[PDB]
Structure 1
Amino acid sequence: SLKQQFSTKAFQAANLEAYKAQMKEMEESFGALLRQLPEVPGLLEDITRTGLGSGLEFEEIKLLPEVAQQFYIELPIQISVVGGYHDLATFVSGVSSLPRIVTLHDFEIKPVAPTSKLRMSILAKTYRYN
């Protein structure tokens, strides 16, 4: 994750306590924007609509346990779909550009039969203020 990339590079910072404070302010601001905003049912709706519009079949949508940070909470959603190569791609971009706070993460893929179909499982995350 971004936060992990910054922590990892912390040794490189000219001023370590200032870098730690900039990381914290970044998260706090993120937390404050989420609080400002009115999503999960609507996100689920948007994701399924995106995938159906792309010609995919859904299999499961797993809501995983929330993971709290100090200022925001992640809600991971594991999405399994199946369809053709291009359709998987239009699903991926449709979802990453939704009018939602949603990020995409690791995926795994496997053929339906050892072209056309591929099965994709992808991790998405949405967020709320802590």
Structure 2
Amino acid sequence: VPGLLEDITRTGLGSGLEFEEIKLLPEVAQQFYIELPIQISVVGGYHDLATFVSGVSSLPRIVTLHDFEIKPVAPGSTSKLRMSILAKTYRYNDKGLK
């Protein structure tokens, strides 16, 4: 199954947004599942950022979102925002924690 990075790009997510950083982190084993985290920083207006969050939220797969941060990039009038978020997908763990 294609990863979250591909889902964003295959379905065309993030219109109007300027990606700054995409970092795929090492998988984290837990006793019931393996987490696949992706850290993303992206710049845009509130509307385009919201559309992106809704797009990820509407994917037909379990994605959890964490560590949401948003700050204006500059003190100017109505300027764009920098949004940081950690997204995770999951797969089963049938092998324990050895």
TM-score normalized by structure 2?
A: 0.78
Structure 1 moving runs of 4+ over 4 Å? 49-53
Q: Deviations over 1:72-96 (max 9, x none)?
A: 1111110111110111101001101
Q: Which has the higher helix share?
A: 1
Shift of 1:41: 4.2
Alignment match, 1:58:
19
1:52 and 1:127 map into 2 onto residues whose CA distance is 20
Structure 2 counterpart of 1:122: 85
2:13 is paired with a residue whose SS is: helix
Any idea what SS the aligned residue of 1:70 has? coil
Alignment gaps of 5+ in structure 1 = 1-39
In the superposition, the TM-score normalised over structure 1's length comes to 0.61
Whose radius of gyration is greater, 1 or 2?
A: 1
Structure 2 stretches of 5 or more lacking a match? 94-98
- How far did 1:51 drift? 6.8
Greater strand content: 2
- Length, aligned pairs only: 91
CA RMSD of aligned residues (A): 2.0
